[PDB]
Amino acid sequence: FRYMPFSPAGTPFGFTDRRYLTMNEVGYVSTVKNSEQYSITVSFFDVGRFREYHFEDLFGYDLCFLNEKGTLFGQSKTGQIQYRPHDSIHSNWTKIIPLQAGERITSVAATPVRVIVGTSLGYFRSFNQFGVPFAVEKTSPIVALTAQNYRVFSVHYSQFHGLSYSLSELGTSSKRYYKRECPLPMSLPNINSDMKKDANLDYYNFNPMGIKSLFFSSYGDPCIFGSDNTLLLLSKWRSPEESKWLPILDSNMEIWKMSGGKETTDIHVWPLALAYDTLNCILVKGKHIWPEFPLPLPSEMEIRMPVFVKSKLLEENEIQIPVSMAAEEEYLRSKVLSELLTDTLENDGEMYGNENEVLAALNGAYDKALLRLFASACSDQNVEKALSLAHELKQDRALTAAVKISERAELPSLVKKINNIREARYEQQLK
Amino acid sequence: ELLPYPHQLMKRLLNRISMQSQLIENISMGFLDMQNESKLPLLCMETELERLKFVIRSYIRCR
Amino acid sequence: NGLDLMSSITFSQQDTNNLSHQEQEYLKEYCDLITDLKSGDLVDIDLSGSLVPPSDVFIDVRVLKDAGEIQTEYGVFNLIKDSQFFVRQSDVERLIQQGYLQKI
Amino acid sequence: ISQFSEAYNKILRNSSSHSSCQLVIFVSCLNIDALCATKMLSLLFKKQLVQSQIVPIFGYSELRRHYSQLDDNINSLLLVGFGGVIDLEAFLEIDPQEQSFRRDIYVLDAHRPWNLDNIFGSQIIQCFDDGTVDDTLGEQKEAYYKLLELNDLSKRKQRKKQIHEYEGVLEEYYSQGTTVVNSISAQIYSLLSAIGETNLSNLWLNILGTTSLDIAYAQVYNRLYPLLQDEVKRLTPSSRNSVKTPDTLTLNIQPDYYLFLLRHSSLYDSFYYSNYVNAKLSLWNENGKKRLHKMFARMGIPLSTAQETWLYMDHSIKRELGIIFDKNLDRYGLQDIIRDGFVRTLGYRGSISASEFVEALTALLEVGNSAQKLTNLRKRWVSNFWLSWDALDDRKVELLNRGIQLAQDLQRAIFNTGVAILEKKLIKHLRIYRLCVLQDGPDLDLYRNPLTLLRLGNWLIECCAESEDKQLLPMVLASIDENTDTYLVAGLTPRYPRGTKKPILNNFSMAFQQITAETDAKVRIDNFESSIIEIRREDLSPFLEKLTLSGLL
Amino acid sequence: LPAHLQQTFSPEEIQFIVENEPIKIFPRITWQLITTDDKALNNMVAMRSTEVVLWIALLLKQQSKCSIVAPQWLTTKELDRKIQYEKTHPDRFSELPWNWLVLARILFNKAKDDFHDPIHELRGKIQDLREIRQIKVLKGLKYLNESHLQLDNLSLLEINELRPFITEIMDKLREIHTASL
């Protein structure tokens, strides 16, 4: 199985002689080939802070990774790498990584204190910001890399194995592992016989794994977005035996609801950045799923839990969702977000300074959405289902509101059951 | 025809337009003495007062 | 009503500047009255011009047909002949109505 | 010594206040490239939100009456190309006041002779010294460096001769002719790329100034044939045509000709300046007024479909000239016609290249309007300069064609008298040069403003651009319109028929120092460019007698 | 004492009452705003919405350190459904953004080169809708009764343009109706 050079959010050439090297929340890096060489132009979204520049390439650097401090270039054939800092304090440096026959650089990464270079045979060579070489480590072949200023996240895959994930940190004294080669059940792309004449064949040839984009969240949670169009977020990463992947977004249901129940395929989702509530994307309209020259304006898309029926939405009728049906989806969305925000503040603390107002508003909407399902259970005379819903309340003021819904529904036995929960929580609080 | 001149609210903010003119009066001068950076917070404050000052300029002339 | 050398209401229609000279004392009794309406405001609000609303804060302005040194207040702008500016908004309002600067 | 990013940030913090901390720039109007460099600098200062003040100065003697009299707290003066030759610090006294000084100018000089004090011994003159010349007279590390500090009867005697050895290398230097080696378009556009601002308007702007020097030198822009190519490909907006977009300003390349302004119009008045091209061959009127009638009146040139035939289906005929001159290539071999060139479009409103575009800017700068007449003459050229600077918007359309229809009569005006002074036969090769004095003809008014005079010479240097295998020396002309015989006399450069190997810049400015140093009997060098001076009527005849013997080439 | 344009507004201040309405942005930057109607924030976070007033954001776009999101009805796939509810209803105009015409003209000066393919489509999809409104307005005024009208959905601009004549015709005919008795 021949490998391919992978980059974050990279697009292939297609039917043109120009393409994008990389793309992220900082900006985008594109190249223009005019019959003999490549012209790399790096443009940013924030014109005020940094200045747009360009240069001529004489080596053909196709591998790139962009962070807040510099730009790293790499060559998959000769093994020559180059790091270019944006500020004028540090000078440029050039070093050539020795590569054997067959072995090629598939993915590169750059942090401000460590340099990560990965190969097709799985050699892990790490360098610092000054160029001092460290110990050489031999592991599984790396096909995908992502980082946000401190850690190394590697994805492994071979011909006699399957997709996995590893989480490590390059400390000052030694390498410490949070997660060591745990299996990742991400679905592989199913190329059929009719795809050989399709116009989207060029995207899968440059990226056989189907990994469109992958990045870390604003609060430190690992995220991945494969070819199955489902956004996966890693929950409970501080505990290796308790780590779980939770799907909180799906593009396949959002396109059908916004288009009025149609079956078109000209609308897609390209992930750029996600800071706990909205995935930034570009609405690409056309046959190709990859962007080209000039980028449209970014839109906002809030996350939604993929829990719907298809036959029930047609009978009840932009497609609109009723009150009663949306209470189940609001309960699932708020429960996942409140648990992750609580563990982040008790272990890492504040990051922006306004986390307490977000947590108070999220916990208030969590108890309010549960009361809508609680009112529906009392109307259908199901006293037993209403008892289990009362135990999921967090705030003490939510238990008082549950009594008033029960008295209005003429259920005196349900009223006394709420008071037993109140006496049990006060006893545990005094221990 | 003419309407009752709501004098009560007018003098209430007529104190305010004196104050923020004096607020930016010192804090620019504090920025000159500290200049041996950000040019945002001056320019917005300068334009915001005069636009409200523009409104009452028309409002008393039509009287 | 007074923006730059007000009482020079001369160089202005001499064949009728004796006509309205009987009306000048009527005219200046507007002008005297318009002064105390400028001062009798308890705060400093302009009543001399600036009727069009402002839009932006940076306006390219050119000059012609004028010379000398003017604008002793709000920083001297050092007006030389036929030389454009690029300034903020509120300064030129007392000069465009004066008729020294020409084009916005 | 001045890294390009450093001076920008340094000049940022020095005047960025919202008061009268006004930095002011100066520019000459006597040069086209001097304009276009400044225009792009202003607009980035707009979007970096700083207050400014722009003043033109047309005269070198005027500089005292525009700076040295009106200053209050200007810390940041800026200037475009004025003092490569004469030292301004000797021209204007500035005493050292308040090592970390209180007011610092820059300079953006574009000329070949430099001034050693302005780079070495820099305390207020922060010049643009970055990777422009790495060999800034590299032998100077001991000449002035031992001139600064200057039994010993035999030792100091040798030491005075070493100073005299240093004296000669400062005597042959500061005695060279001048050009512009590198355009001011090249520097500031490279500076902005170090900052990295992507706008095709900039890429449309910077190529204008280097296009202006296509008629003054040859191999300066021959170095820039790659630097035009890479940028239009690296700043590729699109791979497709993506048609019917009224915006987006698409950039391409198309071939083009010395026969000029064709895409704007007139294959009719091409007939004159086709004979200009045959004035580059062997004639001015005679054979061509037969010879043109094999290649031209082949098609009668219409009235309505000539809006379409010499706009559109002249592409069948540009191809046809393209398949005429390929068989005029191994046989004629005259390669002043086929050229690579550059073009732009606006989505609509016709295709306008940059070859003809510099032509409209020259003529529109010209027309478009004791010692009491020169003041009312000098107030004109500043004013009509001003209506050309705003020509770089889309907002000027029906004034853009005004210069266009102005240009195609001015050449018809200038050729009307050039054919006269030929047939008068008043060019006399005396010994060194040729002298011509236009004592009086018709229409003398269009020779006060000197920008027409270099073009008249540009036509006149090419009448003598035959073989001429001895005496390749340009001319000196003479004309007078106004009182007291002002006589804006000027010199030209010799030319090469596309074969510069010999270092031919100028010899006259060396002699212009000599005659000005003799008697000061009403001679003037108040005009800016050293290639133009003035003379009195009774002094031009002893001028040449001083010049026919003083062989300084 | 203007004495020039008194009975109506000039077209330079009708934009002045609409610029003081807030919309949403995408911020980029990190005291800041004490402008008596401020809501200054801290180090502001990108990839998020915020109700910000308009005129400061236009000034924030000239220094170019933020970006704008268009309002939710500014796609071409949305305006088409407006043109069908009116073409079946010649009685009146159906559904109105209420300040749409002055909103686009501000939005076409470095607020157009941000959005995803609006040229040769959006000015197509607006200038048609201007006249369809004013074709509707020509049939309405022919049906003029005495002292009672029905204008339900009009932009502010046509209100500044129907204004200075619609008064004095019905006012001058108010005399001959009333002074007859």
Side-chain angles (χ1 to χ4, degrees), chain A residues 15-18 32-34 37-43 47 50-57 88 293-294, chain D residues 5-6 8 12 47-48 189 192-199 229-231 233-240:
Chain A
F15 293 99
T16 61
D17 291 331
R18 292 181 295 103
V32 175
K33 181 178 180 180
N34 64 34
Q37 62 182 357
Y38 292 98
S39 296
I40 298 170
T41 301
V42 178
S43 296
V47 187
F50 293 99
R51 300 288 182 268
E52 183 178 1
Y53 63 96
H54 65 279
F55 64 98
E56 183 178 2
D57 194 0
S88 296
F293 281 172
Chain D
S5 89
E6 300 321 290
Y8 185 46
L12 182 140
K47 75 162 159 289
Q48 268 61 248
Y189 168 61
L192 186 132
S193 55
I195 316 159
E197 276 74 24
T198 65
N199 265 308
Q229 272 223 4
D230 49 356
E231 290 324 288
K233 262 77 171 186
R234 293 178 179 83
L235 274 76
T236 296
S238 62
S239 157
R240 200 181 182 273

Side-chain angles (χ1 to χ4, degrees), chain D residues 32-33 35-37 40 183 185 201-214 342 344 353-359 361 392:
Chain D
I32 305 309
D33 54 336
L35 170 134
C36 71
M40 81 182 57
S183 156
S185 175
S201 90
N202 311 140
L203 188 43
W204 164 238
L205 256 291
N206 48 0
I207 61 177
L208 288 156
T210 176
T211 310
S212 158
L213 205 67
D214 291 325
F342 200 69
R344 88 201 277 244
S353 166
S355 88
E356 75 281 23
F357 198 60
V358 68
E359 184 44 60
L361 263 295
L392 286 314

Side-chain angles (χ1 to χ4, degrees), chain D residues 109 131 392 420 446 509 548:
Chain D
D109 277 343
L392 286 314
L446 268 305
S509 283
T548 176

Side-chain angles (χ1 to χ4, degrees), chain D residues 70-87:
Chain D
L70 286 173
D71 295 312
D72 43 358
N73 58 305
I74 296 106
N75 67 319
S76 300
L77 195 140
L78 190 57
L79 181 135
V80 190
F82 280 84
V85 50
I86 307 111
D87 177 78

Side-chain angles (χ1 to χ4, degrees), chain A residues 183-196:
Chain A
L184 182 62
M186 186 176 73
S187 296
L188 293 175
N190 49 5
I191 298 169
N192 290 318
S193 66
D194 57 355
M195 294 299 291
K196 298 291 180 68

Side-chain angles (χ1 to χ4, degrees), chain D residues 429-434 461 463-475 494-497 504 553:
Chain D
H429 193 286
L430 273 73
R431 204 187 66 90
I432 311 168
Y433 48 88
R434 309 186 189 100
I461 195 49
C463 78
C464 42
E466 64 100 15
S467 51
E468 263 306 311
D469 43 359
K470 190 176 179 179
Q471 283 298 98
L472 304 149
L473 203 68
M475 293 77 77
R495 276 287 171 130
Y496 272 0
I504 45 171
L553 195 149

Side-chain angles (χ1 to χ4, degrees), chain D residues 262-263 305-319:
Chain D
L262 187 138
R263 300 171 186 87
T305 179
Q307 272 86 5
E308 306 175 70
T309 54
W310 56 257
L311 276 299
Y312 178 82
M313 87 169 203
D314 71 332
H315 92 295
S316 68
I317 321 289
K318 196 192 195 303
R319 207 191 309 124

